[PDB]
Coordinates of N, CA, C and O in Angstrom, one line a residue:
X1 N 121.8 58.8 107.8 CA 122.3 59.5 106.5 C 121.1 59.8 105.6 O 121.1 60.9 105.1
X2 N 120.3 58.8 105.4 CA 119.2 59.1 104.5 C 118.6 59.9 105.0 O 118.4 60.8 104.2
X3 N 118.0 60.0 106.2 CA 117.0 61.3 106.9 C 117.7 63.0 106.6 O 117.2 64.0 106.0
X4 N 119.0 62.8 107.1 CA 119.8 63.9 106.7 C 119.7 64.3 105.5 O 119.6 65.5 105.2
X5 N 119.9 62.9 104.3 CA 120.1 63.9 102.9 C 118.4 64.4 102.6 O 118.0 65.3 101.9
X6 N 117.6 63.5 103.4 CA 116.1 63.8 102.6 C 115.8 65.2 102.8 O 115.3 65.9 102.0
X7 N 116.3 65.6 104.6 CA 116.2 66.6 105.3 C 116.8 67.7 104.0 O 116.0 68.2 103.2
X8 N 118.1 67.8 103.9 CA 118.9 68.6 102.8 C 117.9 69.1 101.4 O 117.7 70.3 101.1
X9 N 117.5 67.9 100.8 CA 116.9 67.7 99.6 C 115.2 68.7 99.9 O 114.8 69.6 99.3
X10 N 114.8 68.3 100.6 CA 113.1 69.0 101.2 C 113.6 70.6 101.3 O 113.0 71.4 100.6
X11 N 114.5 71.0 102.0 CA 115.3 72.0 102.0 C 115.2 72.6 100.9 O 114.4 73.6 100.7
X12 N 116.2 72.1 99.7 CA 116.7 72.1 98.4 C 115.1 72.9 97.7 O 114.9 74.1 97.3
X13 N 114.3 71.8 97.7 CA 113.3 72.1 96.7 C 112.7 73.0 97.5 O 112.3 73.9 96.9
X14 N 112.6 73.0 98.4 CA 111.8 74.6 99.2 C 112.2 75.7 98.8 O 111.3 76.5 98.7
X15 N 113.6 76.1 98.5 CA 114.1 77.1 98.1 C 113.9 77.3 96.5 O 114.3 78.3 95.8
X16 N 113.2 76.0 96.1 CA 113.7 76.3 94.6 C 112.5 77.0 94.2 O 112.4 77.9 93.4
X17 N 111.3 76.3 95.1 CA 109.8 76.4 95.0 C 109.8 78.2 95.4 O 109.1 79.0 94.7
X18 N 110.3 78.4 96.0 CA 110.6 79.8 96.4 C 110.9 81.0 95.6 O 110.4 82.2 95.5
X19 N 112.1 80.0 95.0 CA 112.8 81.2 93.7 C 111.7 81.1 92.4 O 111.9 81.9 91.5
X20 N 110.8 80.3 92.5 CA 110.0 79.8 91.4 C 108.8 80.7 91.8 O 108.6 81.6 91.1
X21 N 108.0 80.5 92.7 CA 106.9 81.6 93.1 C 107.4 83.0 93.1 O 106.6 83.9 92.7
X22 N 108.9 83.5 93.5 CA 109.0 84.7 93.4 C 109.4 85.4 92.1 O 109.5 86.7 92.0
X23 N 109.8 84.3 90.7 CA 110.2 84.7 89.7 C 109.2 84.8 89.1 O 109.3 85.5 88.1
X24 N 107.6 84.1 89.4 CA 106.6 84.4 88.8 C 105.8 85.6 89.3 O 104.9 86.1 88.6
X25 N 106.1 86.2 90.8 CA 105.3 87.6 90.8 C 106.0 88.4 90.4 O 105.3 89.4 90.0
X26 N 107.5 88.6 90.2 CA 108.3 89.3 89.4 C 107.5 89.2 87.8 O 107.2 90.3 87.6
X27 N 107.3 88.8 87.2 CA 106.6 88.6 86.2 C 104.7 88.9 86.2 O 104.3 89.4 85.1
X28 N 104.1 88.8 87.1 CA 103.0 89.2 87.4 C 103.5 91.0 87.5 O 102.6 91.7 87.0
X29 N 104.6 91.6 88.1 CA 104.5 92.5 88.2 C 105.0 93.5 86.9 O 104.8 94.7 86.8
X30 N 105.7 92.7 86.3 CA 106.1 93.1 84.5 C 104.7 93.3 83.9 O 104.5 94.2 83.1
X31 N 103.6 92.3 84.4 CA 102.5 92.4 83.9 C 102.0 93.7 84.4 O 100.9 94.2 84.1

């Protein structure tokens, strides 16, 4: 269970890191 949620969670923040790098070249490109 814990592998699975950690699995889910690693997941989670990858995508968030994602939406976060791409909201800042969106912004690099406003620049």
């Amino acid at each position: 269970e814990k592998e699975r949620q950690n699995r889910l969670a690693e997941e989670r923040a990858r995508r968030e890191e994602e939406e976060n790098r791409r909201k800042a070249e969106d912004e690099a490109r406003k620049k």
